[PDB]
Each structure stands twice: as C-alpha cells, then as structure tokens.
C-alpha cells in the first residue's frame, strides 16, 4: 500500500530562473510595469498553492523548503554553539554560575559600542545573554569549549546535509504525491522514530553524560577535574562509583528488576536544591518513559501490513446522532490540502510553545535557570509570543483552506458544514462573552481605579476590600501541594513548588520559585487573559468562518483570501477578508501576550523572585506590590511600567544601553506603524505622483512606476511595524529591568 513513489530529475538545477525574477507566477513573470510587482514578488514567493494547481509540485516545494528551514536552524545552532565555544564565558560560568552573567556575544570596538561588552563576570567582557544555552550546556554536561566547537562544526555539517537534501528532494529525486499522502507511515515514524527514538537517545545522553557530569558539577568539582563523558562509556567503574546500578548493566533491565535502577532514574519530583533546576535523574526517566510511549504510539497506523488503524477507518467510525455523518471526509481534506494541516499543526505547536513557557518557569528543568531571572523571563515571554503568532497563523491558514482548498462537491465534510451553517451563533455567543469578559475583567480594574481615586479603597475589588479569590485555582493549588501522599505516592514531594504548601528552593542568594499565592489580582488578570484570548478567537474564527460568504459579501471566496475590500458600498466593506481579520487578531494577540508577560514579570518580581538572605527573610524585587497595585491600571502604569522602566532609561552609558536604545527605537517603529494603519493608499499615491512630477522634471522618471503600497500591504506593514515596535519595547524593558536588578 505505502511505497517510496519518487520521480527523478523533474526540475533542472540552473540559475536561469534566478535571473528571471517572479518566474513562479504568470502575472509576475513578465516584468515590473509598477513597483507593486516587487512587493508581489515577495508576497507570492511562498504561495505555492497559487503558483501551481497540482498538489505534487506544492508538496515537493514545501518539503525542500522545510529542508531549507532545517538548514537554517542547524546553522543557527552552529552559531550559538560556536559563539559559546569562542566568544563566551561558559568555561568560567560553570565555576560560579550564580554570580557570573552568562555571555556569548562580544562586540567589536569601533564607535564606542564596546561599552556593550560589560562586566558580565568570569574575567570576560560581553553581552549578558538571556537564551539559557549555558543552562542547557550545564544540563548536557559540556564542561568545556572544545565540545561546543565540535557541536558547531557538526551542526554546520547537518546544515549542509539538509541543504543538499532539499536540493536532492526537489531537483534530483523529488517525491510524488502518493508519498506525502501516506500520512499513516508519517505519523508512525514521527511518533516512533523522531519523538520516540529522539527522546530515547536523549535519555541515553541524560543517563550516560549529563547525570554523571552534573553529579560532580553540583558536588563542588571544577570542570577541569571532571572525567570526560566518554570515560563513563569506556570505563564503567567511574560511572558506577556514583550510580552502582551500572555494575549490573542491563540485567536489571531485561530481567524487569528495575527497582535497582532508581539511583539515576528517579521519581523524586521537585527541584534540585543545589542548583534550582529539576532533578536530571527524573528527566532521564522522563524521556525514557516518553520514548516507550511514543514507540508504542507510532505502531498505531496501518502502513503496509494487516495491522494498524487506517485513519479513514477511525474518522468514519465517529458519526454523531444529530451531528450528522461526522468526521467522514476529513482524511481527504487534510491529505489533499497543505493549508489545513498547516493550520492544525500551527495551532497545536503554538499552544504547545505557550505550555512550554508555562512549564519552564514552574518546573525549571535546567540548572541555574530559575536564578537567571533574565533567562526565565525572556524564555517565558519568547515562547508566549511564538505561541500567539503560531495560533494567529493557524487562523490565517484555516482561512486559506476555506477559500482555496475547501470544496463541498468533491472534498466534502459534514462537521465543517454544520459549523458554517450556525457560524452566526458561534460568533454571536463569542461576541457576547467577549463583552461580558471585557466588562467583568477590565471594568473591574476601572472600578478599582475610580474607587481609589475617589478615596474609597474599601470599595475596590482587592484582597482587602472585596474578595474575588480564585477559589477553584486555590483548590487546585492546595491539592497539588498536598498531592504527594494518597493520590501520588512514591514522588517524595510535589511535582512543582508553585503551590502554597510547597517550599522555597534557596539557590545562592536567590530564591528560585517558592510558592505563588493567588489573590484577587490574579483573578482579575486571569479573566483579562481569558478576555483577550476570547477576543482573538472571535476575530480569527470570524475571519475563518466568513472567509467564503457573509450576509454582506456572499461571494467573498471569489474575491480571494487576501483582498482589501469590495468598495465603499454597503456602507463600506473594508477588512471583510480573512486576511484583515487575522491582521486585527495580530493586534489582539499582541495585547493578550503583552498583558500576559506583564502579569508574569510583575507576579514573579513581587511574589516569587528576589533574594533570600542566610537568615531566611526573602525580599522580593518589587516588594510584593502586585496584589495591591495590579488591581488598578494606575499600578501597572506606576509600579510596573513607570517604576520598572527606571533601569532601561537610566541605562545610558552602561552595558545595558542598547536596551534603552531599542526601547526608544521600538517605540518609534510602533508609532511609525501607525502611519500605515491609520492612513490610506490614495493619499500616498497622489503624493507619489506629485514627487514623480518633480522627478520627470529632471529626467529621473523611473520605469518601475512608483506606486503607493497596496492596501493589504499597508495593513501588513502597519501590523508588522506595530508588533515589532511593541514587542521590542517590551523585550528591551524586560531585559534591562531584569539584568540590572537581577
């Protein structure tokens, strides 16, 4: 059934098409009559569904494009590991990681920018990075710079291999459509073979290399004194001196006597109190169990043999009573459309990035991550933003499916039709609950603000005036703190210490994630988060559902996914397109993730992070001013924005001065974006035609006719400059704030 259907030499390797730009499209492969052409050359560059009509060439194009992306990421990791090897203080950071700033970038002394090379620590002048690569490397048992250079060279090798792979799998031997459509084998392999064997091999590294090395690094051993990792593979006596279960080898394994493996495959949940990260002993067992699970999960789908679930046979089996035929047809609209799959995988990968952000602060998995408050904050914020962007792109590509790849005649689905039928009900109830949440989450902030301004602090919604305690979250918190016991024995402690009954993991002078107390401010801000998420889903789901038709435009699909409008008629029908809906959902994702990372930064700096002296008195970075000031907007303006932006603006003449520079610059780029979002094309075309008169007066009339940006392009430029500016403002503000007071 499944096979390796692949055809040779379909496309010629030649620069002939490089010389002819815009070759991929018909209207673009004839010349730039205008300047918009170049914007259409980049816009449609990766719109392979519009270049061709057959799915075979599209699948080959995106396959080799994924290979290019993997080449890029291998080259990026090459850069990171190399810069760690040569331009870093990692060899010194291992000695005193609680006081040396992790730095992996040095600037060139030319124009005074050598101030950026600051006193990170370790006898090294550079930039205090906030990526957490140093923490990984301590978790990977690197203990050198040679290993990092070798890793960089190997990553460069794999980058070149992936580049050759894309070239081979497009130009030399490109797979045909029967190969991609065999999703059964693809899932069987990516579950068991990528995620199963990948987690298994990382468990092997974690058992053989990370665990024995971190058993010494945490035990006051200098990295120069540690035995090399391969010495544990060659000499098992040195490995057994700390974990004697290796003296028996795999006889405990194959005889199912796993009870004599707990020296290195543990379940003692919680954070290693010597470094603040999770127990690597638990992470080895984790990735091992995940290997078992993905290995049994990747033998689920029939590929060639009589066993396995045909995914058609799973989907067609589910047919609801008043839900109609049910999931019949979905295997044909997911295997004959890349955009549907792209949307699904984007949505899940984005929510997974967010879950990563959430589980990487509350269960610090790397050593000296929780105490590197810059790394923790930056990683949470990063992955939150990536998740929001991926979800918003999932919306865009659901819409693109609905416009292009949706065919109720051939590739019919029942549930999608049922969703389209009562789409007005969906959007009406979402448009209601967004207003309800908006009111009962932000009008509460307004109420607190007014009551505090009228001198009525006894009337706010605070932890002192009117109790809005998260009773449900408090119950989950208290039962997860008292989870070690009847419900989860053999764990020795809670799976995390972000719950009230937990304890404080004092690492050096720092505090590293004691319990998080949930009060009225957490209720208010969590409902603000639900609000912003619900409005984003309103906008995006509305764009997806009404991508094809509305009461306003019933032929919206014929106009396309990415179109500005259908004229000033009907009172005006700007931004009816799903592209414009996702362009608005970008702003709302921005507001959502911005208030999310603000909640994170403030709740952490006030209720979690800080410094605990040897007497035991923990003093937080702000001073616990979240539950009292995060109930009103003036606190976010005063105690969070105004106050914590006293280290990014005062950082002029310091090592953190590029942060204030990009603070002002990202401010600027955001505001500059407002020139695009607010304005319209017609003014700029008329202005351009005036200055084109000024040029034609001097025989400087360019043949590529100067055209103002297309409307959808003005909206794209506006949203990208707006997001870049707000996000770089926040990035600079967070990084300078959290590196300065640290």
């Amino acid at each position: 059934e499944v096979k390796i259907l692949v055809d040779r030499d379909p496309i010629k390797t030649s620069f002939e098409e490089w010389a002819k730009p815009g070759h991929f499209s018909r209207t673009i492969a004839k010349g730039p009559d205008t300047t918009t052409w170049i914007w259409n050359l980049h816009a449609d560059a990766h719109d392979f569904d519009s270049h061709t009509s057959d799915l075979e060439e599209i699948s080959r194009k995106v396959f080799s494009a994924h290979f290019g992306q993997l080449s890029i990421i291998f080259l990026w990791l090459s850069g990171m590991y190399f810069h760690g090897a040569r331009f870093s203080n990692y060899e010194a950071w291992l000695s005193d990681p609680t006081h040396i700033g992790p730095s992996a970038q040095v600037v060139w002394p030319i124009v005074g920018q050598e101030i950026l090379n600051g006193d990170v620590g370790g006898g090294f002048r550079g930039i205090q990075i906030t990526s957490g690569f140093f923490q990984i490397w301590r978790a990977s048992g690197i203990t050198s710079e040679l290993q990092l250079y070798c890793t960089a060279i190997g990553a460069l090798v794999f980058a070149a291999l992936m580049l050759f792979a894309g070239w081979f799998h497009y130009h030399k031997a490109a797979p045909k459509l029967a190969w991609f459509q065999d999703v059964e084998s693809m899932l069987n392999h990516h579950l068991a073979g990528l995620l199963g064997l990948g987690s298994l091999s990382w468990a092997g590294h974690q058992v053989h290399v990370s665990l024995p090395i971190n058993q010494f690094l945490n035990a006051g051993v200098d990295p120069k004194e540690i035995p090399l990792p391969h010495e544990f593979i060659l000499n098992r006596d040195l490995l057994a001196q700390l974990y004697p279960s290796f003296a028996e080898g795999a006889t405990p394994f194959f005889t199912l006597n796993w009870s004599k493996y707990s020296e290195f495959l543990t379940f003692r949940g919680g954070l290693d109190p010597v470094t603040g990260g999770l127990w690597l002993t638990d992470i080895a067992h984790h990735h091992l169990a995940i290997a078992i699970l993905f290995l049994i999960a990747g033998h689920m789908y029939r590929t060639n043999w009589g066993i396995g679930h045909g995914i058609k046979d799973i989907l067609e089996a589910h047919k609801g009573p008043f839900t109609g035929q049910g999931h019949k047809g979905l295997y044909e609209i997911l295997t004959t459309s890349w955009h549907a799959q792209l949307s699904l995988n984007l949505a899940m990968l984005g929510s997974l990035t967010i879950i990563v952000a959430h589980h990487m602060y509350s269960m610090p998995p790397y050593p000296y991550l929780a105490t590197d408050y810059a790394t923790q904050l930056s990683l949470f914020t990063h992955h939150m933003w990536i998740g929001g962007f991926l979800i918003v792109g999932a919306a865009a590509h659901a819409a693109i499916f609905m416009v292009r790849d949706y065919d109720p005649t051939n590739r019919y689905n029942d549930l999608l039709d049922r969703v389209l039928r009562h789409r007005d009900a969906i959007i009406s109830h979402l448009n209601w609950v967004c207003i309800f949440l908006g009111f009962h989450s932000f009008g509460l902030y307004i109420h607190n603000d007014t009551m505090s301004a009228l001198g009525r602090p006894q009337d706010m919604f605070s932890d002192t005036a009117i109790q809005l305690q998260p009773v449900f979250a408090q119950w989950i918190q208290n039962t997860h703190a008292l989870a070690p016991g009847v419900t989860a024995p053999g764990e020795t402690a809670s799976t995390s210490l972000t719950w009230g009954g937990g304890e404080l993991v004092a690492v050096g002078g720092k505090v590293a994630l004691l319990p998080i107390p949930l009060g009225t401010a957490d209720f208010l801000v969590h409902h603000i988060h639900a609000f912003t998420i619900h409005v984003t889903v309103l906008i995006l789901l509305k764009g997806v559902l009404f991508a094809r038709s509305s009461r306003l435009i019933p032929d919206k699909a014929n106009l396309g996914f990415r179109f500005p409008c259908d004229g000033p008629g009907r009172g005006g029908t700007c931004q009816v397109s799903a592209w414009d809906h996702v362009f608005l959902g970008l702003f709302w994702m921005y507001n959502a993730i911005s208030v999310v990372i603000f909640h994170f930064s403030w709740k952490m700096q006030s209720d979690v992070w800080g410094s605990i002296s040897d007497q035991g008195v923990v003093t937080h970075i702000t001073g616990g001013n979240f539950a009292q000031s995060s109930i009103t907007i003036n606190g976010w303006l005063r105690d969070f924005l105004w106050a914590q932006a006293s280290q990014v603006i005062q950082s002029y003449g310091s090592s953190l001065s590029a942060y204030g520079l990009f603070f002002l610059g990202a401010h600027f780029v955001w505001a500059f974006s407002l020139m695009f979002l607010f304005s319209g094309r017609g003014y700029w075309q008329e202005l351009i035609e005036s200055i084109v008169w000024a040029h034609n007066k001097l025989k400087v009339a360019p043949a590529t006719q100067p055209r103002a940006l297309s409307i959808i392009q003005g909206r794209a430029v506006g949203v990208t400059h707006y997001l870049l500016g707000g996000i770089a403002t926040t990035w600079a503000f967070f990084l300078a704030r959290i590196i300065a007071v640290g």
């Binding site: 010389a19 730009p21 010349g31 730039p32 009559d33 170049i38 002394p109 050598e114 090379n117 600051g118 006193d119 006898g123 090294f124 002048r125 003449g653 034609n696 007066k697 001097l698 025989k699 400087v700 009339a701 360019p702 043949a703 590529t704 006719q705």
Partner: protein, 154 residues
C-alpha cells in the same frame, strides 16, 4: 569665544567630562588582569577617549556650560570644519549619487523594457557611469545651461 561658548581647549567642564569617563572606564578595569584582552581593550578605549577629548580641544571646538562641543554653523571661517567643509564634502557625494543615478536612468530610457534594468542593474553600464559623477558639478551646470538638466513638458 562666540555665542557665549568657551573653547574646549580652555574649558573646565570638558576636562571634567574627560576625567569622569576615564574614571568610569578605570572602575571597569580593576576587575581583570592588566595584560589580558579585556584590560587591553579597556586601555585602548581609554586612550581613544583621551585622544578624542584632546582632538576636540585642539580643533578649536566651542564647549558650552554643559561642557560638550557646540558646533557653529553660521559660517564663521574658524568653524567651517564644523558644517561648511563637510557640507561641501557631503553635497559632492550626494550629487555624485544623484547624477550617476540620473545618467543611468537616462541611459536605460532608450531600452525596450527599461524597468528590468532598474531591477537587474546593468553593472557594466553603471560602472562606466559610476565615475561619471565625479564631474557632476560641471556636467550638471552645463546640462542646466544647455537645457539638458530639466526636462521639457512635451
């Protein structure tokens, strides 16, 4: 001594800026050994700062009460190094850019599809023109006299 500004060669606050920056860079210098790369780079930046301040002193820059060089643009012969000589240095290059670009657009104007030469820049043509903007202040003047600078409406 114009505009109430003292020169920087005889300013107090300018030397104070010098001393303050040097003490700032020396405070960041007592954390490394005096022979390693960070201390060597810090000493190089220190000499850079000291020569910078002394060069701003010896050029006759005018340092105000805040102790920073205030450039004079009015046209004083002593302060043509502030604006007028670099202004001519600018305008010479800027007109070079404009003139080679204009002569390039006029060169491709007699093409079948000229726009493809604005995308795919004809590097031989431009390179033969790229030095033709060296003489722009005279070629442009003649094109203005001959009538070839400004186009006619028809």
């Amino acid at each position: 001594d114009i505009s109430g500004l003292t020169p920087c060669k005889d300013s107090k606050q300018f030397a104070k800026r010098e001393k303050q920056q040097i003490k700032k860079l020396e405070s960041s210098l007592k954390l490394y050994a005096p022979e390693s790369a960070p201390a060597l780079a810090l000493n190089a930046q220190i000499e850079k700062t000291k020569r910078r301040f002394d060069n701003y002193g010896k050029y006759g820059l005018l340092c105000g009460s805040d102790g920073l060089p205030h450039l004079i643009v009015n046209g004083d012969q002593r302060h043509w190094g502030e604006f007028i000589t670099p202004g001519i240095l600018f305008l010479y290059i800027a007109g070079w850019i404009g003139w080679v670009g204009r002569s390039y657009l006029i060169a491709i104007s007699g093409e079948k599809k000229p726009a493809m030469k604005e995308i795919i820049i004809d590097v031989p043509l431009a390179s033969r023109i790229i030095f033709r903007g060296f003489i722009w202040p005279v070629a442009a003047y003649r094109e203005f006299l001959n009538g070839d600078l400004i186009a006619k409406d028809v």
